[PDB]
Amino acid sequence: NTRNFSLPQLQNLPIEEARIVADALAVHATSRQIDSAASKLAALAEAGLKGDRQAYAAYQQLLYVLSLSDDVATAQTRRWLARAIYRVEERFMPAADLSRALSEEDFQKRLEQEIAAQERHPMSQYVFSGSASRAQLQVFLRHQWFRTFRLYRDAADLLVNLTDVDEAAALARYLYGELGEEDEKGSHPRLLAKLLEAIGLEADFQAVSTMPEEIAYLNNRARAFRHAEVGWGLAVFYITELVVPGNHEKLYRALLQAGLSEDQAEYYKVHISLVPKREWQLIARRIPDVQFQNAFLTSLSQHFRVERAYYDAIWEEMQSV
Amino acid sequence: NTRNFSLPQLQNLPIEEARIVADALAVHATSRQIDSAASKLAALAEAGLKGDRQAYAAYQQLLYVLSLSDDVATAQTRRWLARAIYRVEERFMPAADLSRALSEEDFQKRLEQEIAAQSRERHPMSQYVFSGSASRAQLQVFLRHQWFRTFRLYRDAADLLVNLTDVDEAAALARYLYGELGEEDEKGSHPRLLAKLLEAIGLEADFQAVSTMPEEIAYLNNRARAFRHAEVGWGLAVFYITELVHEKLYRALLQAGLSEDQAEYYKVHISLVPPRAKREWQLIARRIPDVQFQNAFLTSLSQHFRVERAYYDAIWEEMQSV
């Protein structure tokens, strides 16, 4: 099916830029049609980020179609257009702006300070404790699907930009584990699908979010993993790998409490185990470079801002059911 | 070093078009500059493909810089410009042009015929090495070119992985990449294993290697194009002929004086599992009934063979000349 292909999604977006983008993605699009789309998308992002709420929603939805549709025929042009948007977004976000590199120590300290200081979101705590209702746990898991199901593709984009063969090898090991090792039935998306199904939810591999904060989270994560300055991607990769085994263990026990079997909750179990590291040298190697430090730190801050708004919205939805 | 970065490479190319390409790679390149570069590149490629031998050499040199340079900052714009060239190349290349899909039996027969016509095992380069006829110097020639084929093959496979939207299919390419990059130990990646072999015969294994052989450049440009193509039939064809369908070289190296450890690169690829038995074959088998897939696949295979033959011929001529 084609529900998450670019053209069906654009046909369903009742705004002027939808046809402009569709024309730019057509097989015989001209350079003028592509440039017009890029200009207009950049202008739209700028208005949104300046406070035009309709322009914000429109550019976010368009970026979601551009960056995350599954019709590979249009992927190169879609990513070309996404960059016109990313260039604007990156001008608006608070930048680390270091004139000189932090010491390996002040750098590692800044990371600890960001992390620890501001995972005990009141929602996580509610779920960890075993207090969530069926409907509330279903809300949580529907959103877990969106975060998990195509994470491996974002990691693959970083793999492509790691020119050093040993560094590519590290990402290839990550991907191999994430996709089930020798058995694709055990890929992490498929593990999570088994869990959703155990609690009466469908796990749609063509899922398209309608939650603004989830869209912004997925859009930011794809941007970060695809960025030509791999500091952006390494920041998201780092924080995900560091925090997952801990959250996933508490989620595992909460799910058992909820009446899921050990086999049904396997998704959360496997992360306690496989993720606790070798990938750290990718970061440690680059720490002396201030430009890597600026990208990494800026990316980390931006990730936290979008993640916080996303978790807040999930908590709100859970509270409303 | 920046020997395989785009701008240093363009500086070494006396071609007028090289100046306009370099300008399109600037941080603040305008749409006008990038579009002008794309038009000039497409016109150069077209002239070359219509028999202007200088234009042909020039566009291949430019494509090699665009598609295979290692400065990631310029990669997105470089690949955008490479596609302007690719569209021209695909327009001029001989194509399968099936109106109706072949049955799987007839598709298989055509593959068998194409492979038999290519007769890779009887190429003079191959026979010369298999027969123990190569001196140390001729062996070095052979291995310097093996390096170019091997050292970044995993990256072309990664491009295909990115274009496989089905999670099960991506999983298959991830298994391939894992094996190619040494599984749990990066010291055992296949490029590193080949590096060990080059060193054992007194050659440097340069991860920033830049070819000066026109036929090698054509071969690498084509392989990258095929594996990056949005129609995965193109990349599946090259994956098939490379990985689905070394022992003879392994034997020849041992009989020449190399140890099993030095020649490990060729041992790890020895297999007797038929192509249809490999799990990756299902990527192809699933798509066979689609005529658009067959056309991409058979076009890609035919083109790959033509560039591979010209390249092996060129290596053979170099080996005879040393």
Ligand code: NI
């Ligand atoms: Ni996982």
Ligand code: NI
């Ligand atoms: Ni290999």
